[PDB]
Amino acid sequence: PKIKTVRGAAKRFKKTGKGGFKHKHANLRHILTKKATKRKRHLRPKAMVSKGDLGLVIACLPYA
Amino acid sequence: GIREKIKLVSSAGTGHFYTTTKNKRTKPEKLELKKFDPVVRQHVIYKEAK
Amino acid sequence: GGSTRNGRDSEAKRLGVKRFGGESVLAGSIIVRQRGTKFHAGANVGCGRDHTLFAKADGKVKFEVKGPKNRKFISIEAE
Amino acid sequence: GFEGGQMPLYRRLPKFGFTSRKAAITAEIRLSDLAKVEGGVVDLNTLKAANIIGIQIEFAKVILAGEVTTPVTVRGLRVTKGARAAIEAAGGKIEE
RNA sequence: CUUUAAUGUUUGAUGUUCUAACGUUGACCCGUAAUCCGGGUUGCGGACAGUGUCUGGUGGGUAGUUUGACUGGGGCGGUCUCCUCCUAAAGAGUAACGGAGGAGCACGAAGGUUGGCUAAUCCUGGUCGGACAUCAGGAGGUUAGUGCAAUGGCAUAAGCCAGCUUGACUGCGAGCGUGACGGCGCGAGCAGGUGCGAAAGCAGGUCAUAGUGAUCCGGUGGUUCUGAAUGGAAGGGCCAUC
RNA sequence: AAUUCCUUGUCGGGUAAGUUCCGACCUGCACGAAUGGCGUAAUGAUGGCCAGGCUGUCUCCACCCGAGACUCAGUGAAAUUGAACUCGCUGUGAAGAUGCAGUGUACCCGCGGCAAGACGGAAAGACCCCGUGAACCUUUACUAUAGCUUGACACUGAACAU
RNA sequence: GUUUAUUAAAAACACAGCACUGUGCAAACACGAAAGUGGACGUAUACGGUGUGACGCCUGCCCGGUGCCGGAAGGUUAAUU
RNA sequence: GUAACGGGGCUAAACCAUGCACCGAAGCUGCGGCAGCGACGCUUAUGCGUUGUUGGGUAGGGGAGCGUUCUGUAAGCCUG
RNA sequence: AGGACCGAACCGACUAAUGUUGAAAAAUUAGCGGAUGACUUGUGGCUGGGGGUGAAAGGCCAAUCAAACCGGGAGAUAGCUGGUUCUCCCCGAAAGCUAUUUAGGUAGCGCCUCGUGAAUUCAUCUCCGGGGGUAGAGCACUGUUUCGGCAACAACCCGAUGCAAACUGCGAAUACCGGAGAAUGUUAUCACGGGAGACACACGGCGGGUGCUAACGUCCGUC
RNA sequence: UUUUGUAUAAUGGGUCAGCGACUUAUAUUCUGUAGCAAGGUUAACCGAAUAGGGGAGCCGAAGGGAAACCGAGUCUUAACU
């Protein structure tokens, strides 16, 4: 039977030009009043997984 | 804690705002002190601080 | 008892010993707290908030000792 | 995804949603195609019947893929100033 | 037509009564030389009780489950995240229910800049001045002072005083350090705009290292990004934020 | 004390000698009045203690009569069992040796008998802990619910008064 | 008198006796989605539930907590409109 | 049960210093043979000569094979 | 008369021995209690499993009971234990860090194997460039100690003497980082990808915490 | 077999013969191999049934952006840095 993709992960990762998956950064939707405006600025631009967790997403997102 | 949170709205019609805290007790008056909101691309006064 | 606990890594130390390739702006010497364990000097300085010996324009590292009663001082000569 | 007991990764990183509902019908044609549409006028459809776009499709972009040679006329389709370029030269006309 | 009473309505209630639903485990008749059941008459009752749906309460009577880990067995006790020093063998890093302490904040100034300033302690002299307030001189030299632990650091002071102030700005960021990862940290320089200085210049918060909570689900404000026939809208996205 | 921890409490009785027993004291670790208090004739295959009688219970075993055991003929099991050419001591060793090292003793094989060892046979230890195991049980653990209850709308109608 | 058939016969259970409490009969209660039935062809000198356990002498003080019985003035409060 | 050199037994068969000899392993060498990889001497499906080197192995990875039943090749071939 | 008395039938089980691969999956023998009663027994009937029944032991409900027996869901689930079968050749681990309702499980990284790429990558040695506060030592500092001294018994101070994981006005060996160069090494090195296993380690040497500088003790670093 | 470690006095087997455990279906990804190649390949079905027809559709030659959209670029930002 056609493998079922991990619905969840498919809402946090986006396969790039190549393997790369492109993802959103954590710590940017809660308790920000007490956070470096530089930290958040360096948090807005979303940017892929680390090859160490990569093999844990291409097994979660079969049809990516 | 006690140090309540506070938001600094732009004096300009713009909706952009800043965020910080302040001791509601000790200092009664509300904080006003200017800043720079990207929208107007210009520095300006910022009010509202309990 | 009532004894235990302890901080963590906080590494802190020299990461650019002696003349190095010294990139456009390597680390050089973290050792936080240190304002005087190592001082800023020459074609490198910075001395960030956490007193991290910055290291400006790329090049060999020096590591000296001058005026104000000895004092370490880290500077970088160009290769 | 079960990374031991600790919270996973597809559960540790936020989720950025919102989906097309328009791209599924917004196609992308290529220079190689064009004249490949058998004859002139690269119409809104035709490409479809030319097994190169797909029924549901409602919109499409010319875009440069390579070929062009034979002068052609695209009808009812979008095009890049880098594609409308590589075509008018090799002969052609844009709908609009 | 606006402020105010009687009639009729409609309408809630309270209180009496009635009979006609409904009850009858009162009597009698018939099916039937049946205590069941049904139908009929009568009596008592009567819109009550009772049942259906909805709803508040009670509900170990019953049912499904949970009730942490480390631990010199387990339990009791203690501990669980973060910061400081030692153990840690002169780069980094390291264990124990090893030895010691701290944090879950504070500050619109205790932040920025500019101008200026420099302690503890003791000696001698001086009204009330007392071991020790304040004044004078000498000695002395980071033994003081850092908003709070400890360590490192501080005179070019990061210590202290005052003037003007909002750089505790916004968008980015060469290149690094540190992590298995999520992530955290340092950062010159660029663009737009600021403050202080005559100027070079400094400022993207506090001498630095603790002072914190991923995700989800939602809340608020902005935006013409999306908007299930079209226009809108609800909802969704993006940015800020709780 | 079916309650007393200290505890063989202290004193009296019983005995040559009494951590038990009986009678008292009261300092009740922590009795107490219907999850009854203190008594009580009778009853008890009920708990404790004492005496007479009795005795092989014992000092301390002896003899005897029978059923096995032993021999012969017939029939004819069992658990257990990696393989056996299956000795002692001292030491070594996964730490308690028939099997390793040293050494000692010993011709080959049965039969009756005894149980010190084969950590002998027997039950995947019930003790202990462990498993994000189970089941029954309890409650002011949670979350649900039968039942018991409340009101509302129905089945449910008519008059008069306030 | 009863009991752990197969390690416990007992001081345990039961018992006559005592008390509290429920129940007006279509009883309380109980079996049963219901009809119906047991209680009882009884009817408060009866029936259920609970604790105590012949008999003798007795059975003290505490209602704050929980439960149960009574009260309604007020506060809070569901569906509903 | 000697059982505090393994034993016998040793007055040097103990101990110290100096020196030569010998015993001693699956180590090193010698000879014969095997396979992975490299070099050169020939040789060019290359494949050999020499020659250098490598070949303890659990979890486990990799690479080569054997044998069994069945289908094609089986009207073939073997078989009283 | 009597839940009266002694005692057979009959009902029952208090003691002991023998039995325990039994004559028997609870009996035999010698004794023991009840024996007109809440007695005992024949035949048949009715209660059904979260249910019955119970003078109450969780006792009984067909040698079965803190939820019977049979069939079905059913190959429940088992991070646990066991078991896992022919041959030759090459390479060859780990018992660690981090997180974990995690601790005898698992995931990322580390370490193995196979493949594809890449450069004086990598390694040893010599030389050159670095930071070092450990060993040792010392006692100005921070504490701690002795003996003198000048001091209304004793502070400071001077001199002489020791001690320190959390003292340092000193300070190695050496380990580590970088640069240069020769030689040797079947690219040992790095990166990407296919396959893993392993996260119980033990002893011995060295530096240590803990313990008694006790343990075949325990916990780190390192070979 | 299990272990840091077993002659172990730790597990298992009295012996023999036969049987006894990494399969199967679909989806997906690598390696090897073959076909074709900026193209490759059909499914159900028709069927003259392993042919041939069927190109519905799937994968690839374009990506970036949440998206509208732009496109060898494109998001980010007022911004060419």
Ligand SMILES: [Mg+2]
């Ligand atoms: Mg098509």
Ligand SMILES: [Mg+2]
């Ligand atoms: Mg329960």
Ligand SMILES: [Mg+2]
């Ligand atoms: Mg369940």
Ligand SMILES: [Mg+2]
């Ligand atoms: Mg535990």
Ligand SMILES: [Mg+2]
């Ligand atoms: Mg270090």
Ligand SMILES: [Mg+2]
């Ligand atoms: Mg500070």
Ligand SMILES: [Mg+2]
């Ligand atoms: Mg007495």
Ligand SMILES: [Mg+2]
């Ligand atoms: Mg009592």
Ligand SMILES: [Mg+2]
């Ligand atoms: Mg009383």
Ligand SMILES: [Mg+2]
């Ligand atoms: Mg022995």
Ligand SMILES: [Mg+2]
């Ligand atoms: Mg015997």
Ligand SMILES: [Mg+2]
């Ligand atoms: Mg045994």
Ligand SMILES: [Mg+2]
């Ligand atoms: Mg067991």
Ligand SMILES: [Mg+2]
């Ligand atoms: Mg009796």
Ligand SMILES: [Mg+2]
């Ligand atoms: Mg019994």
Ligand SMILES: [Mg+2]
């Ligand atoms: Mg008995």
